[PDB]
Paper text:
The principal constituent of the protein deposits is one of the most abundant proteins in the extracellular matrix (ECM) of the human cornea, transforming growth factor-β–induced protein (TGFBIp). The function of corneal TGFBIp is elusive, but its ability to bind both integrins and ECM molecules indicates a role in cell adhesion. TGFBIp consists of an N-terminal CROPT domain followed by four fasciclin 1 (FAS1) domains (FAS1-1, FAS1-2, FAS1-3, and FAS1-4). The X-ray crystal structure of wildtype TGFBIp reveals an elongated banana-shaped molecule with the five domains arranged like pearls on a curved string.
Among the most frequent pathogenic mutations are R124H and R555W, both associated with granular corneal dystrophy (GCD) characterized by the early-onset formation of amorphous aggregates. A striking feature found in both the R124H and R555W structures and involving their mutated residues is a crystal packing interface between the FAS1-1 and FAS1-4 domains of different TGFBIp molecules, where residue 124 interacts with residue 555 in a second TGFBIp molecule (i.e., His124 and Arg555 in R124H, Arg124 and Trp555 in R555W). In the much more hydrophobic R555W interface, there are no water molecules close to Trp555. The interface is organized around the Trp555 side chain, and similarly to the R124H interface, the tryptophan indole ring is surrounded by a hydrophobic shell of side chains contributed by Phe547, Leu550, Leu558, Leu559, Leu120, Y121, Val163, and Leu167. A crucial interaction sealing the pocket around Trp555 is made by Arg124 from the second TGFBIp molecule, as its guanidinium group stacks with the tryptophan indole ring in a cation–π interaction. In addition, the Arg124 side chain further stabilizes the intermolecular interaction through hydrogen bonds with the main-chain carbonyl groups of Leu550 and Phe547. The FAS1-1:FAS1-4 interface in the R555W structure is significantly more hydrophobic than in the R124H structure, with a ΔiG p-value of 0.11 and 0.40, respectively. This R555W FAS1-1:FAS1-4 interface is also by far the most hydrophobic in all the four TGFBIp crystal structures determined to date and has a calculated ΔiG of −9 kcal/mol, which is also the most favorable value of all the intermolecular contacts present in these structures. The Arg124 and Arg555 residues in wildtype TGFBIp do not permit this intermolecular interface due to size and electrostatic repulsion between the two arginines.
Author numbering: 46 to 637
């Protein structure tokens, strides 16, 4: 009875006093916890009965400070010789009472303001912690302000979805201790008035002179002066200095890159550090996601403990000081955003082939970079041939793969025109298909691909004529009158049977070709799809209309293309007027 829980991280005095819950966080900021049991606010154990069945009497607000252990608050209240009669007297009051540890751990700046004029400033601080009406935590809505009893100065309230409540980012430790004339809330810090907006803090602090100048040049000072709830992850001078000067001046002197940079430090609502007890994904005003988390008493951004000062309060939100600059992809060159990524091998090869200048400056390009796993079994060598192929992985203009359309053509720096194939569940450029989301830089975009491109060199007939396995196919095509179809412009998919395929036909099948050139033509045309289906465009099952009219059933299973239950021996031989897939038996006519 009257049952409450204490969750202590081990090593500390960091405690979360709660209503007993049914699911408790195993770890708080990566540090495991022990759980304990206390009696709830205002109840005491009697020996021989379990729980805490006895309620304690209410007392006035001054006395309740003692009941919750806020004895320094009492001592200082008694010192003022003014406020204790008010706390014992008529009215309805809230006090956010700092804990003894809070008063004993004053930041040097609040100690400074008190010791200047001790009697008056202690009375003012104590009044700032109070409100002239009772307010329970049920009435503490996120983002509200309460008017304190010091000069009508606002107190800022946050009430996060995980139940943590903060008062000027001080954590509310023990809530809703009723008094005969109000309520006592025990808080974790001594709070002070909030007099500057975010822009004013930028303009005051010498650690933000570089940020200040960037904000001014971008024109963002208007927003940071305005009404709003923001978190600024404010980069210090030291953060900017860690960036090579040629990178930084490139970003700061370009209005689009400068604005994306600054926006990538701003979140759309105010977030006190004490809110964060596990990983949380947030989105910046630039659009990038950051992983906010924590390790002990250190806030982390993407796992890196780069927050050197937490919870600097402004009238329009919260500032946390950050030691590294959060450069978004949209401010980067292609080399900057790709060199340490899933395509870093491919990026290294562009560099070794003398093509790095395309990636390191302001050229408007799209880069087709295969994944590192493509090069698991080795890298091509740095020739003129590899150089030339790599130049044909560099596209003119900055593109977004999602806005590409079927039949679009892309011009390369090697002078080639590559074909875009848009299928239902994949996007391919020639034989190679997009394998991850774009990374959009300032001037160029990285497309991550699953394969090295193989640009076409000749027509279908050039392909078939160049390989000894298709001599019967080439002769049959001529005999069937199909040769010039397959050497002129088109979008064919040729399931090309080898010589062993034709010799495997039984006599009853072969003898249907004898004296019947139109039957040979009909058979060959059944092997020719009327649109280009590279293997990366094949899902569970796709119908492809042949030139004979009936449809082929094409599927991909265990990374092998099949057509009418015939596996492809060698896929994706690209041609200027189609794609060739090799098969080792002739296709059987199916069901329509």
């Amino acid at each position: 009875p009257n049952v409450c829980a204490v969750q202590k991280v081990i090593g500390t005095n960091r405690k979360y006093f709660t209503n007993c819950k049914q699911w408790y966080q195993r770890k708080i900021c990566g540090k495991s916890t022990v759980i304990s049991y206390e009696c709830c606010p205002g109840y005491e154990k009697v020996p021989g009965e379990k729980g805490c069945p006895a309620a304690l009497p209410l007392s006035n607000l001054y006395e309740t400070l003692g009941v919750v252990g806020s004895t320094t608050t009492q001592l200082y209240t008694d010192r003022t010789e003014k406020l204790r009669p008010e706390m014992e007297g008529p009215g309805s009051f809230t006090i956010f009472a700092p804990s003894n540890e809070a008063w004993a751990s004053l930041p040097a700046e609040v100690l400074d303001s008190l010791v200047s004029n001790v009697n008056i400033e202690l009375l003012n601080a104590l009044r700032y912690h109070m409100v002239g009406r009772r307010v329970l935590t049920d009435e503490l809505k996120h983002g509200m302000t309460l008017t304190s009893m010091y000069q009508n100065s606002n107190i800022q309230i946050h009430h996060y979805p995980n139940g943590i409540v903060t008062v000027n980012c001080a954590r509310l430790l023990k809530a809703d201790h009723h008094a005969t004339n109000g309520v006592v809330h025990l808080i974790d810090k001594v709070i002070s008035t909030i007099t500057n907006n975010i822009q004013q803090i930028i303009e005051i602090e010498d650690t933000f002179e570089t940020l200040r100048a960037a904000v001014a040049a971008s024109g963002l000072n208007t927003m940071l002066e305005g009404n709003g709830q923001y978190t600024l992850l404010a980069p210090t001078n030291e953060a900017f200095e860690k960036i090579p000067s040629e990178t930084l001046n490139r970003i700061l002197g370009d209005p689009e890159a400068l604005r994306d940079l600054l926006n990538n430090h701003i979140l759309k609502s105010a977030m006190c550090a004490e809110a964060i007890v596990a990983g949380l994904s947030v989105e910046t005003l630039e659009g990038t996601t950051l992983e906010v988390g924590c390790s002990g008493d250190m806030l982390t951004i993407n796992g890196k403990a780069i927050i050197s000062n937490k919870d600097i309060l402004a009238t329009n939100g919260v500032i946390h000081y950050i030691d590294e600059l959060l450069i978004p992809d949209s401010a980067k060159t292609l080399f900057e955003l790709a060199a340490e990524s899933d395509v870093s091998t491919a990026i290294d090869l562009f560099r070794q082939a003398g093509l790095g200048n395309h990636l390191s400056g302001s050229e408007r390009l799209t880069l087709l970079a295969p994944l590192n796993s493509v090069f698991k079994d080795g890298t091509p060598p740095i020739d003129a041939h590899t150089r030339n192929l790599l130049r044909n992985h560099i596209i003119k203009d900055q593109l977004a793969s999602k806005y590409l359309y079927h039949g679009q053509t892309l011009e390369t720096l090697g002078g080639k025109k590559l074909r875009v194939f848009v299928y239902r569940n994949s996007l391919c450029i020639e034989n190679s298909c997009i394998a991850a989301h774009d990374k959009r830089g300032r001037y160029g975009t990285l497309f991550t691909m699953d394969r090295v491109l193989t640009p076409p060199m000749g027509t279908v007939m050039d392909v078939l004529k160049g390989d000894n396995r298709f001599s019967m196919l080439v002769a049959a095509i001529q005999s069937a009158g199909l040769t010039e179809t397959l050497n002129r412009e088109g979008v064919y998919t040729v399931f090309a049977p080898t010589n062993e395929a034709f010799r495997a036909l039984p006599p009853r099948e072969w003898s249907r070709l004898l004296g019947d050139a139109k039957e040979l033509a009909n058979i060959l045309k059944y092997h020719i799809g009327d649109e280009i289906l590279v293997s990366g465009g094949i899902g569970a099952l796709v119908r492809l209309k042949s030139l004979q009219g009936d449809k082929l059933e094409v599927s991909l299973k265990n990374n092998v293309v099949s057509v009418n239950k015939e596996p492809v021996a060698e896929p994706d031989i690209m041609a200027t007027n189609g794609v060739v897939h090799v098969i080792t038996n002739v296709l059987h006519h199916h069901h329509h």
